[PDB]
Homo-oligomer: A and B are copies of this chain.
Amino acid sequence: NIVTLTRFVMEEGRKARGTGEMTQLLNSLCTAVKAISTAVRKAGIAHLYGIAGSTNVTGDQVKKLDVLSNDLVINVLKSSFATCVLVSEEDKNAIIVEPEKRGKYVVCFDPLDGSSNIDCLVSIGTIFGIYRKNSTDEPSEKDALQPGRNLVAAGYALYGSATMLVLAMVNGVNCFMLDPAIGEFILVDRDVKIKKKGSIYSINEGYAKEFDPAITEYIQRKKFPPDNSAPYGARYVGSMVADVHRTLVYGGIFMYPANKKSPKGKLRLLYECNPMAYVMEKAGGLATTGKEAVLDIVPTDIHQRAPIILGSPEDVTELLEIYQKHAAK
C-alpha cells in the first residue's frame, strides 16, 4: 500500500511506545519543509511584481528565502511543543524555547543550505539533526553540544528538480518524495543502502593549492587510476544537501577538507556534518574528518566546523588509508 511520511512517523512512534512528542516534532518539520518548498519554487512571485497593483504591502516585506526558511523552521518547531533548544545555521546563539512550548528535543538545523546557489536557482535544501535532552538542568546550548552518535533522527529536504525528504533514524534511511499536488510526502525508497563503491568524486577543486597531501594524492588517483581503470567522474553542485543526496543514491565520495581560509574545514558539525554523517552511516556509508569519525566528535561550540569526507565505504576507506599511510611514515 501507499505510505505517506505522516503515516510512517505515526507508526514508528507507536512501535517505540513513545509519548508522541517525536511524532509531533517530525509532523511539524514536514509542514515547515512543505512551506519552504512552495516558497523556493516561487509560488506567488507575481504579487511581488505588482500583478494586483501596489495597495497590499505598506512598507518592507521582501523577505529573502534564507530568512523566510529560518523563520518557518523556528516557528513551526516551537509550535510542536516538542523542543527546548534550537540551533540554526542562521543564528549566532542557540534559541531557548519558552517554557509554555518546551519539549524534550534539541534540534540543530541548516534552514536553507547552499547560500551561494540560491540566486542561480541551483538545488538547495534544509538539513536537520534531532537529539534528546540528556540533562535535568535548565535548557541551554550545552544540550546541543552532543556527539552525532547521540542523534535520534536526522536528515534533509532537498529542493531540487523535485522535493524529497530523506529521514534517517536508528532503524535506517527512508526517502519520501513530495507530491506538491496533494502536499504529501510519499515513501519511494525504503531502507536505503549506499553502494559499496561509486564512480563519482565531489569536491571544490578551486582550493587545490591548499589541500593536504592525502586529499591531493586521492584526487590524482581518481583522474589517473593506478590500475588503469576508467577515471571517476566529477560532480560538485555546490550545495552540500544536493551533493550528499547524489552521493547517497549514486554512490561515490563527497569531500570538504580544510584549507587556508577554513583550517578546520568549512562545514559546520552540528547542522551539516553530523546530520549527513548519521544518514551515511545508517545507509552503510562512512563519514570521517580523515582522522576520526565525525559522529564521535564531542563539540564545544554550536557553530564548530569540521573537515568532512563521506560516502561509499570503499571510497572513503581508500582515502582514510592514504591518511593512515602518511601518518605511519
- Contact, CB under 8 Å: A41 / B161: yes
Interface membership of chain A positions 68-94, coded 1 if the CB is closer than 8 angstroms to chain B and 0 otherwise? 100110111011100000000000000
Also in contact, A44 and B236, with CB within 8 A (given A160-B161, A161-B118, A206-B201)? no
Beta-carbon contact of A204 and B234 below 8 Å: yes
Stretch at the interface among A133-141, A142-150, A242-250, A313-321: A242-250
Partner of A72 from the list B51, B101, B186, B234 (CB cut-off 8 Å) is B51
* A232 contacts chain B at the CB level, 8 A cutoff: yes
Interface of A is mostly: mixed
Whether the Cβ atoms of A79 and B7 lie closer than 8 Å is yes
Q: Which residues on the B side are within 8 Å of A80 (C-beta)?
A: 7
Copy count, this protein chain: 4
Q: How far is the CA of A179 from the CA of B181 in the complex (A)?
A: 11
Q: How far is the CA of A71 from the CA of B245 in the complex (A)?
A: 29
Q: Is A312 an interface residue (CB 8 A)?
A: no
Residue in contact with A71 in the complex, picked from B49, B52, B178, B182, CB distance below 8 Å: B52
Please name the residue on chain B nearest to A38 by beta carbon.
Answer: B181
Question: With the chains together, A6 CA to B60 CA distance in Å?
Answer: 29
CB neighbours (8 Å) of A63 from chain B are: 55-56
The 7 closest A-B pairs by CB, nearest first: A183-B183, A121-B160, A120-B246, A208-B223, A43-B181, A53-B75, A42-B162
Q: Is A102 an interface residue (CB 8 A)?
A: no
Q: Is A304 an interface residue (CB 8 A)?
A: no
The interface on chain A, measured as residues whose beta carbon lies within 8 A of the other chain's beta carbons, has a size of 99
Q: Across the interface, do A121 and B182 meet the contact criterion of CB distance under 8 Å?
A: no
Instruction: Assess whether B158 is in contact with A121, with CB atoms less than 8 Å apart.
Output: yes
Please indicate the chain B residues that have their CB under 8 angstroms from the CB of A250 in the complex: 119-120
Is the beta-carbon distance between A52 and B34 smaller than 8 angstroms?
Answer: no
Interface segment, one of A24-32, A282-290, A295-303 = A24-32
Q: Once bound together, how far apart are the Cα atoms of A237 and B43, in whole Å? A: 24
CA distance A223 to B11 in the complex (A): 51
Q: Given the complex of chains A and B, what is the CA–CA distance between A29 and B234 in angstroms?
A: 33
